[PDB]
Coordinates of C-alpha atoms and ligand atoms in Angstrom, one line a residue:
X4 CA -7.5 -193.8 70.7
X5 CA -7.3 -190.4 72.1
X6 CA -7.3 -189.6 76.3
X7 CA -11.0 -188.5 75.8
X8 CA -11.6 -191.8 74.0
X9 CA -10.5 -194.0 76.6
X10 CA -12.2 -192.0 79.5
X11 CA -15.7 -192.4 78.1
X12 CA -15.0 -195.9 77.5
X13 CA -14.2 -196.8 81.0
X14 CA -16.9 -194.2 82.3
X15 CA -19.6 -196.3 79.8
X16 CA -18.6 -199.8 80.6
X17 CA -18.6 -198.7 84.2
X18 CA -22.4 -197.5 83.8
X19 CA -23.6 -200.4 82.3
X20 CA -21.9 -202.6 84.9
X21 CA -23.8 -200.4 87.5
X22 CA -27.2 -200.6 85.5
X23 CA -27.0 -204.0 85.1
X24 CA -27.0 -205.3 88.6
X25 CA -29.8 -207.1 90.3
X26 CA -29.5 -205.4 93.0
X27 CA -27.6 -201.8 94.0
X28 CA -24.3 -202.5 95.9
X29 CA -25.8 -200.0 98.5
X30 CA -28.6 -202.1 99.3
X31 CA -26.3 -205.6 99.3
X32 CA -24.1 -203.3 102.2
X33 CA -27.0 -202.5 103.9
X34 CA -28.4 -206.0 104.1
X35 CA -24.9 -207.3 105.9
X36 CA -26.6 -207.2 109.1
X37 CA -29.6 -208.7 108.5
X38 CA -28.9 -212.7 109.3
X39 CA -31.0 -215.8 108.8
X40 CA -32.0 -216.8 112.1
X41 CA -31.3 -220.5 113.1
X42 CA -35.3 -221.2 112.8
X43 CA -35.0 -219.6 108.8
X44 CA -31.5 -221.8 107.9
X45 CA -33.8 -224.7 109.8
X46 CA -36.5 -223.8 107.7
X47 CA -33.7 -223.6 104.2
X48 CA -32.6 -227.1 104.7
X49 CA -36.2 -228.7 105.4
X50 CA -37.1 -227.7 101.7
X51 CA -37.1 -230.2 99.0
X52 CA -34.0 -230.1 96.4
X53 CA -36.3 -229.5 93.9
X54 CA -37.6 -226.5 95.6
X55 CA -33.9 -225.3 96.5
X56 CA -33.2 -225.9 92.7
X57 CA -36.2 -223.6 91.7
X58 CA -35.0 -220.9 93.9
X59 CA -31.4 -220.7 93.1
X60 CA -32.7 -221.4 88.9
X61 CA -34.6 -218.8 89.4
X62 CA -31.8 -216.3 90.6
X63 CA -29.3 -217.6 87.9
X64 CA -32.1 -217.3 85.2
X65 CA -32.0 -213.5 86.3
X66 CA -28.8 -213.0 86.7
X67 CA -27.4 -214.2 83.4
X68 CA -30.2 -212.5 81.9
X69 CA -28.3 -208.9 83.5
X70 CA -25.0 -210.3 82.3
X71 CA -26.6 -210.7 78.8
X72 CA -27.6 -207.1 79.5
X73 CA -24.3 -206.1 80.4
X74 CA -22.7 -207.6 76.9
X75 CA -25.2 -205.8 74.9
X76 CA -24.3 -202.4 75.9
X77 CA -20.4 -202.8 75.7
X78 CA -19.1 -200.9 72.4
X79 CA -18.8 -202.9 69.9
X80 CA -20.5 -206.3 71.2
X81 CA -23.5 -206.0 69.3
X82 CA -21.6 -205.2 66.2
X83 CA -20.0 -208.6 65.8
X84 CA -21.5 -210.9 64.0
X85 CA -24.9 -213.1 65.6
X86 CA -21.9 -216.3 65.6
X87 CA -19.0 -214.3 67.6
X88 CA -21.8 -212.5 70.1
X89 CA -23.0 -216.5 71.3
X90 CA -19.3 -218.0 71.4
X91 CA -18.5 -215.3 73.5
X92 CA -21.3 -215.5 75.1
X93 CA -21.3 -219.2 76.3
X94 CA -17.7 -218.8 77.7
X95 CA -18.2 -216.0 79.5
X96 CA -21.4 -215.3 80.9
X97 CA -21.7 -217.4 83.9
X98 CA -17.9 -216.9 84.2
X99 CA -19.4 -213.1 84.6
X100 CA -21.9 -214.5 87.4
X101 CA -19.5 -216.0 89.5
X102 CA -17.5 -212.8 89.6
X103 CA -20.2 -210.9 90.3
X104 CA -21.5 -213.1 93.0
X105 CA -18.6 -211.4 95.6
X106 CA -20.6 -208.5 95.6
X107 CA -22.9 -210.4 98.1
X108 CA -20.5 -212.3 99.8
X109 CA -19.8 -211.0 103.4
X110 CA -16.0 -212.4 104.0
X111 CA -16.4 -211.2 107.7
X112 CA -18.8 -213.7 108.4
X113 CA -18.6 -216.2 105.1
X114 CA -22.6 -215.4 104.4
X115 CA -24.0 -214.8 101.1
X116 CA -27.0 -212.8 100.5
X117 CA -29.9 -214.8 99.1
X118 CA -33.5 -214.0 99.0
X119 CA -33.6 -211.1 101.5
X120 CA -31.2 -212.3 103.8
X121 CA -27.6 -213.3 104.4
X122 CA -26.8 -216.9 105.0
X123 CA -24.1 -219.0 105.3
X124 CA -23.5 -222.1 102.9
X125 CA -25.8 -224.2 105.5
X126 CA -28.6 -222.7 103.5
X127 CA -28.3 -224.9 100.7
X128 CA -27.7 -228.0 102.5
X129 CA -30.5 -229.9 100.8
X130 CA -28.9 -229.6 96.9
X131 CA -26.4 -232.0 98.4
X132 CA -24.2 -229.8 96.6
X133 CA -21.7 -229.0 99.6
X134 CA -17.8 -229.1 97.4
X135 CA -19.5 -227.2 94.5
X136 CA -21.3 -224.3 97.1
X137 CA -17.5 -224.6 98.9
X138 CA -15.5 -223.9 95.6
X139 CA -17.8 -221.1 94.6
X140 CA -17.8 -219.7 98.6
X141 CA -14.0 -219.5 98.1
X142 CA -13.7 -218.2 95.3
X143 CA -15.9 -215.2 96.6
X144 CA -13.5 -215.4 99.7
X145 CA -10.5 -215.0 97.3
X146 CA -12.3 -212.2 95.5
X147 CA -12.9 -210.2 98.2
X148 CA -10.2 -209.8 99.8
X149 CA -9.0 -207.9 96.5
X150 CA -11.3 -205.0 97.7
X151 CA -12.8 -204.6 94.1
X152 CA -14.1 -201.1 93.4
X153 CA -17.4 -200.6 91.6
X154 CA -15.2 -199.6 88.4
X155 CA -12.8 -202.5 88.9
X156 CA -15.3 -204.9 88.7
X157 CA -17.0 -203.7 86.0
X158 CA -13.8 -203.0 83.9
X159 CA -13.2 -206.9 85.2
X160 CA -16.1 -208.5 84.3
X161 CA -16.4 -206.6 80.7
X162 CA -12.9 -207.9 79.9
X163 CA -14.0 -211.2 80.8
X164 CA -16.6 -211.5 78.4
X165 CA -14.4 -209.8 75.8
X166 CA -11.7 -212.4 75.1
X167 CA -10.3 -213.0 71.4
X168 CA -8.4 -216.0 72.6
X169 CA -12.3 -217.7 72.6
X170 CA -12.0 -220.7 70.1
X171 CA -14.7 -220.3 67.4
X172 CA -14.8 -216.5 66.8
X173 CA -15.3 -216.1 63.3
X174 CA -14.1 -212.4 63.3
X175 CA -11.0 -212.7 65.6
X176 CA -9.5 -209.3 64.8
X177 CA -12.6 -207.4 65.5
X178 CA -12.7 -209.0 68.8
X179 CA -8.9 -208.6 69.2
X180 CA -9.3 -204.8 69.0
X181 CA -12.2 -204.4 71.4
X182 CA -10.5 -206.4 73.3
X183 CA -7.4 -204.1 73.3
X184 CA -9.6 -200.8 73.9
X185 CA -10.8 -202.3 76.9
X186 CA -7.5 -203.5 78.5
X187 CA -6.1 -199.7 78.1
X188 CA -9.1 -198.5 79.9
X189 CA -8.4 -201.0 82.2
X190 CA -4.9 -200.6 82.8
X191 CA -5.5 -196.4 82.3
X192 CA -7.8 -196.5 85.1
X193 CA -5.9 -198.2 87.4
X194 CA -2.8 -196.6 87.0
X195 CA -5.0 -193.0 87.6
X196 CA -6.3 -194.8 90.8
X197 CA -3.3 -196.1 91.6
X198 CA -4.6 -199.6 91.5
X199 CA -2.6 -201.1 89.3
X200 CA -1.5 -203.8 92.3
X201 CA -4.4 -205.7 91.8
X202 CA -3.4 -207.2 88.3
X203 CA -1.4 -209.5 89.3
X204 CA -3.7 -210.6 92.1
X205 CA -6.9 -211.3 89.4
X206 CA -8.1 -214.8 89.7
X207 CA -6.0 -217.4 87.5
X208 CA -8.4 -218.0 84.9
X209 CA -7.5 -221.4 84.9
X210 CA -8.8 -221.2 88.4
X211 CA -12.4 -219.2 86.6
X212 CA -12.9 -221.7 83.4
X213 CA -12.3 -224.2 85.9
X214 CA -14.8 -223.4 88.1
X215 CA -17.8 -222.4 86.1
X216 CA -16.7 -225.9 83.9
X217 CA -17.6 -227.7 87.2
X218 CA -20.6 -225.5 88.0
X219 CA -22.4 -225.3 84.6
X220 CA -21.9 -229.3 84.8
X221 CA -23.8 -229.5 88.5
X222 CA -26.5 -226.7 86.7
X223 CA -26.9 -229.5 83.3
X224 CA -27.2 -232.0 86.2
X225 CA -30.4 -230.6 87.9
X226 CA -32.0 -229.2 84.6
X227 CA -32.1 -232.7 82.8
X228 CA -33.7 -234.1 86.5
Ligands
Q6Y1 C1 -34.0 -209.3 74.1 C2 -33.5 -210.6 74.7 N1 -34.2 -211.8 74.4 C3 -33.8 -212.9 74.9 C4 -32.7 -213.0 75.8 C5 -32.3 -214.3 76.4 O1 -32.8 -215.3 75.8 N2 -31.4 -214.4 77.4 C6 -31.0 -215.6 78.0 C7 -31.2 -215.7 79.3 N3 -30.9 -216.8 80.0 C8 -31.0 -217.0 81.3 C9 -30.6 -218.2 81.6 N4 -30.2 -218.7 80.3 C10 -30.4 -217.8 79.5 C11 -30.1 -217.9 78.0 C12 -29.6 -219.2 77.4 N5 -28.1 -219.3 77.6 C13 -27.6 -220.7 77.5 C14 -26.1 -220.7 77.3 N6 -25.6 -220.0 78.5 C15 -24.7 -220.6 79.3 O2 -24.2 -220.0 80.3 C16 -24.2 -222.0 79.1 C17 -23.6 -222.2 77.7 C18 -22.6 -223.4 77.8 C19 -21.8 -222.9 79.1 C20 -22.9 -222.2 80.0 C21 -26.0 -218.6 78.7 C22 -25.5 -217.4 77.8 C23 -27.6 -218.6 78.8 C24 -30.5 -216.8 77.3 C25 -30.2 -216.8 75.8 C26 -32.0 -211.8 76.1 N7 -32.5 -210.6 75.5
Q6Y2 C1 -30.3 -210.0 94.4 C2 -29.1 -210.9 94.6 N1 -27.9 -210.5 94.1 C3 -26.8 -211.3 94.2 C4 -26.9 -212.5 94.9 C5 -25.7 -213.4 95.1 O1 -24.8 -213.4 94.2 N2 -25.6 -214.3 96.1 C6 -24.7 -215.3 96.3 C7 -23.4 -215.0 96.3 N3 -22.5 -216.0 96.5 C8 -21.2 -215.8 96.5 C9 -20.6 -217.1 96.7 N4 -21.7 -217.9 96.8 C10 -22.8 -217.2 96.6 C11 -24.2 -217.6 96.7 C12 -24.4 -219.1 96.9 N5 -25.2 -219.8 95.9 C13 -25.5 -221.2 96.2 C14 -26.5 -221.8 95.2 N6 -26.0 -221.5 93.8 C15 -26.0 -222.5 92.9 O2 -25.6 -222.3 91.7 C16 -26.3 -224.0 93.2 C17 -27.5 -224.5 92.2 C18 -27.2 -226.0 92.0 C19 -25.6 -226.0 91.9 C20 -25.1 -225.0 92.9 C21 -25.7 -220.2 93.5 C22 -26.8 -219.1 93.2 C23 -24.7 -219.6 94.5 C24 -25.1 -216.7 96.6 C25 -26.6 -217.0 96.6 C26 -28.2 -212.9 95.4 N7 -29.2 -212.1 95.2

């Protein structure tokens, strides 16, 4: 691939990342300051589970709907066959959401924005959920303090979703190739940005699989309730 190549790739993945969000990072900035109060966490942890579940559903419903988005407008994705597009798919997409949930995570406080305001994880005290909200607070924590740019995540999160090493893929070497176009944007971009420190600071993906394995379980849990 040429220079010219690999710039509009990282400049296109970078826009769809940007497109694709639920909400603007400008506006999740903005929001830092606006706190719960102690008489809205109060009011939070008096709601049913069942109502917690519906609200927190509800955002997930939307935000793997953006990460779908997200896949769809990465070169290449939606030329693999219907099979590959779903195994890749089904690894990665809410591995996708939990990355992208550090954007509203405010380390200087540990409060997450969620429904207008920021809280911390108090909020969700009645989906007697308290290890799993931990693990997923932390790994926002961790994530964080990485200082993502707007292009680093969105570099990130597509190379996340395109992984040959997937079991199931049907058309390996099609994905293998993507997959290498999008590492040398990658790796391009952060050695123009001088950035290139944060790659071996990127979550173990151990750590990730692990994670959303233990997540997408609690998520099974509630929808079969
Ligand atoms: C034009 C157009 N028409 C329809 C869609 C659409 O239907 N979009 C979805 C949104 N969603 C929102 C919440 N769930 C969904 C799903 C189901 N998916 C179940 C498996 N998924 C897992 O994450 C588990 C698989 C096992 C591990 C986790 C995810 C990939 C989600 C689809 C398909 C998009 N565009
Ligand atoms: C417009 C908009 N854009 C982004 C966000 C966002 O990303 N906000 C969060 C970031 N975080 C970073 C670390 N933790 C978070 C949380 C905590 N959430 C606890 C409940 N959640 C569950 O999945 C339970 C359902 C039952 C099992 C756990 C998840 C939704 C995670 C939120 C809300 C919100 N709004």
């Amino acid at each position: 691939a040429s220079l010219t190549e690999i710039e509009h790739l990282v400049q296109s993945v970078c826009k769809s990342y940007r497109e694709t969000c639920q909400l603007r990072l400008e506006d999740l900035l903005r929001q830092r300051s606006n706190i719960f109060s102690r008489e809205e966490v109060t009011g939070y942890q008096r709601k049913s589970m069942w109502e917690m579940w519906e609200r927190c559903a509800h955002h997930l419903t939307e935000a793997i709907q953006y990460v779908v988005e997200f896949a769809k407008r990465l070169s290449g994705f939606m030329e693999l066959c219907q099979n590959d597009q779903i195994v890749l798919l089904k690894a990665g997409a809410m591995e996708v959401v939990l990355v992208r949930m550090c954007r509203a995570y405010n380390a200087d406080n540990r409060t997450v924005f969620f429904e207008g305001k920021y809280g911390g994880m108090e909020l969700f005290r009645a989906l007697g959920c308290s290890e799993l909200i931990s693990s997923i607070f932390d790994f926002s924590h961790s994530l964080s303090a990485l200082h993502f740019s707007e292009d680093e995540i969105a570099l990130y999160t597509a190379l996340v979703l395109i992984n040959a090493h997937r079991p199931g893929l049907q058309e390996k070497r099609k994905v293998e190739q993507l997959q290498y176009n999008l590492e040398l944007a990658f790796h391009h971009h952060l050695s123009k940005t001088h950035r290139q420190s944060i790659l071996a600071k990127l979550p173990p993906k151990g750590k990730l699989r692990s994670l959303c394995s233990q997540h997408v379980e609690r998520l099974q849990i509630f929808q079969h309730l």
